[PDB]
Design a protein around this ligand. Structure first.
Ligand SMILES: NC(=O)c1ccc[n+]([C@@H]2O[C@H](COP(=O)([O-])OP(=O)([O-])OC[C@H]3O[C@@H](n4cnc5c(N)[nH+]cnc54)[C@H](O)[C@@H]3O)[C@@H](O)[C@H]2O)c1
Ligand SMILES: NC(=O)c1ccc[n+]([C@@H]2O[C@H](COP(=O)([O-])OP(=O)([O-])OC[C@H]3O[C@@H](n4cnc5c(N)[nH+]cnc54)[C@H](O)[C@@H]3O)[C@@H](O)[C@H]2O)c1
Ligand SMILES: OCc1c(F)c(F)c(F)c(F)c1F
Ligand SMILES: OCc1c(F)c(F)c(F)c(F)c1F
Ligand SMILES: [Zn+2]
Ligand SMILES: [Zn+2]
Ligand SMILES: [Zn+2]
Ligand SMILES: [Zn+2]
Lengths: 374, 374
């Protein structure tokens, strides 16, 4: 039995920015009241994890990163009511406490207990469950999925179907749900509309899936890497454009293509310039643009507010607008019911021990999602 | 009869920026096909007319400004079907051609025939109906209401109730409809919500009217001129705040007052800084901010897109989002049925000949709306 005891296990520790993960032994404390210790089964490599490595996202180091995952409950702390040992679960990088003003709001999902806004890198109680080489190691987004075992707060975990394939449904923990919800819930893409998606990685492809599911008539993928176009078309893009092929700015190209601007645009990269381009390419009177990408820490964009005064709507969201604990089990049930596909996002499957190789596939442009298996 | 003849009449001509208007004789050509010549009865002084004087808003000079008005049709050109001589009318500074993609869209109002995005200062045919001292004089927004007679395109005029009091309903041509619609149509303010309005002039008071009509529980007025607070409370503000009273930035004050951010905020001034402040003060996960104020020409704001990524919605609108020709007659009908009040906006009345005094009253801070009578 491991319940109640410190577990020594393998994890991928990030000791400093811009260096490889170190795969080594950590100690994982047992869960305290209202905490859940999970044996990980599969975790995806999301660009936001790479942002921690690159310094694009600032969070306390050293850290166990990883936020897109699935596993099996090993043990529960006193007072836990929503999961039990043996349950398949997805950690929730956006919590759902159910009590704050956001959780109670019909359209809010960015629960006030999150660790995104002002990251502390801890459990809810302000302490860590992880040590390595005698040193405390920070959590990441309350999840820390790059470890054989993690500990999460109850508000940061959802129980999912016992028959789920965890090596696929881990994507519902971040990239699929974020893109799909950005289309269907945050933008509320309409039947017959024209959409433009900037960035054709895992998240952008999931935005395309949602735009097709919503009945869009035209779905224009935009990427500087033309190797991304074939899969974008497979999942619903009606055409793809590479800004580098054009003498004119791409907002002008997209405005011309759409006979005066698109209905819905999405920034799914994380650049200031493409956030402003994406806003500009939606129709000036009734267009909607959604920011999905995460831009570099503490940098401001510049824009002319006449883009908004004419009638455009500009919004962003975390995790596709989904209230996380309510939505994750339903998404997994919908996947089990064949309502959407996840295989198109999965290009590589590697053992956890190859985490660094997985990040190198992302950075080289070669992968969409690598799933690491423990 | 004057039909088919040039009319000589008085107008207020702006020859140069940062100068008084010149009240002097102009020649007003008869209407061409699908044009309407109107004998003006009343026009309001809106801050956007002052923007032309100050160079905040760039439009070709020399010009006959004025865009908030009501009058009586003197004559119609060939092919006009929607008004007749003797009808009471409101010129529409935002046209409604009824044929473009925006006019056909359920939520668009910024008709593609507008002369706002890139002003030419002409009729739809690219010419002028005005001569002064033998020189052609530009139009403004297709309306040019600071004249005893104007000529407008048919898509830029709406027929209104024959029993309408034109010295009141002129405000439906700009400031009332803009503010009220910005609350009720663009933001879609909800019952029980908390709203913050930056700027308590005629437009911001009209926003407050709309937030009260929509059932808001708290309506916080924000102005650096505390003389504006009494009227804001009369029309529905529950409290008023002056940024100059506080050590901390007003977005922080409003976030504290609203226990974590407001549901709806409105920028109703025309400053880049208060557009960002207004966005920031709305709740980060579900707040909505609407830009109503007109920014200084060609200047960009700077903002951190994390404000949007957490879930805020940022939008702007012209004319309260109202499709102008459909909506103006209904708004007049509702005013006649006492569905809303206009008198709180009217602080001064002057004859047209005293236009410059009217602008002095606006610039001093003393007036809300001065109504000029021809
Ligand atoms: N809002 C959220 O909740 C959330 C969740 C998941 C991911 N993200 C962010 O979303 C973004 C995309 O993540 P991902 O899909 O995993 O990343 P990814 O797989 O790196 O995809 C990014 C795509 O952008 C393309 N690209 C790069 N520069 C340009 C350019 N100038 N123009 C057009 N295309 C360009 C690039 O070739 C690649 O295919 C990242 O910034 C993530 O951090 C946000
Ligand atoms: N979007 C549209 O369709 C539309 C229509 C009508 C008016 N406008 C614009 O809306 C704005 C307001 O028009 P209005 O009500 O006629 O003007 P106004 O009567 O000049 O009112 C503006 C108010 O802003 C106040 N103010 C100035 N600076 C600040 C500050 N730093 N903080 C707080 N308050 C401040 C000022 O004291 C005044 O009471 C102007 O920019 C107009 O050009 C836009
Ligand atoms: O990919 C999801 C994701 C985000 F959307 C962020 F805004 C963030 F800060 C982060 F760490 C993260 F993992
Ligand atoms: O006051 C209404 C109004 C506007 F909202 C503008 F954006 C504009 F350019 C203009 F000239 C105007 F009069
Ligand atoms: Zn919460
Ligand atoms: Zn992610
Ligand atoms: Zn039109
Ligand atoms: Zn106006």
């Amino acid at each position: 039995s491991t319940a109640g005891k410190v577990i020594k296990c393998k994890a991928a520790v990030l000791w400093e920015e811009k260096k490889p993960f170190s795969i080594e032994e950590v100690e994982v404390a047992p869960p305290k009241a209202h905490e859940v210790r999970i044996k990980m089964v599969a975790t995806g490599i999301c660009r936001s994890d790479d942002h921690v490595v690159s310094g694009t996202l600032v969070t306390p180091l050293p850290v166990i990163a990883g936020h897109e995952a699935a596993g099996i409950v090993e043990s529960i702390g006193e007072g836990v009511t929503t999961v039990r040992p043996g349950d398949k679960v997805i950690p929730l990088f956006t919590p759902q406490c159910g009590k704050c003003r956001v959780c109670k709001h019909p359209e809010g999902n960015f629960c006030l207990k999150n660790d995104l806004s002002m990251p502390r890198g801890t459990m809810q109680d302000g302490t860590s469950r992880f040590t390595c080489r005698g040193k405390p190691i920070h959590h990441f987004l309350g999840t820390s999925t790059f470890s054989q075992y993690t500990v999460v707060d109850e508000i940061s975990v959802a129980k999912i179907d016992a028959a789920s394939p965890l090596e696929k449904v881990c994507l519902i923990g971040c990239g699929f749900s974020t893109g799909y919800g950005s289309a269907v819930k945050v933008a509320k893409v309409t039947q017959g509309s024209t959409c433009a998606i900037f960035g054709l990685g895992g998240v952008g492809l999931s935005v395309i899936m949602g735009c097709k599911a919503a009945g869009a008539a035209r779905i224009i993928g935009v990427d500087i890497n033309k190797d991304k176009f074939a899969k974008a078309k497979e999942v619903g893009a009606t055409e793809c454009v590479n800004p580098q092929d054009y003498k004119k700015p791409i907002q002008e190209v997209l405005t011309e293509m759409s006979n005066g601007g698109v209905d819905f645009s999405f920034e799914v990269i994380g650049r200031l310039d493409t956030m402003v381009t994406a806003l500009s390419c939606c129709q000036e009177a009734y267009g909607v643009s959604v920011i999905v990408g995460v831009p570099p820490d503490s940098q401001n964009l510049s824009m002319n507010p006449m883009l908004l005064l004419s009638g455009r709507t500009w919004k962003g969201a975390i995790f596709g607008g989904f209230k996380s604990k309510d939505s994750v089990p339903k998404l997994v049930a919908d996947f089990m019911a064949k309502k959407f596909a996840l295989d198109p996002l999965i290009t590589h499957v590697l053992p956890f021990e190859k985490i660094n190789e997985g990040f190198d596939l992302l950075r080289s442009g070669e992968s969409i999602r690598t799933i690491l298996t423990f």
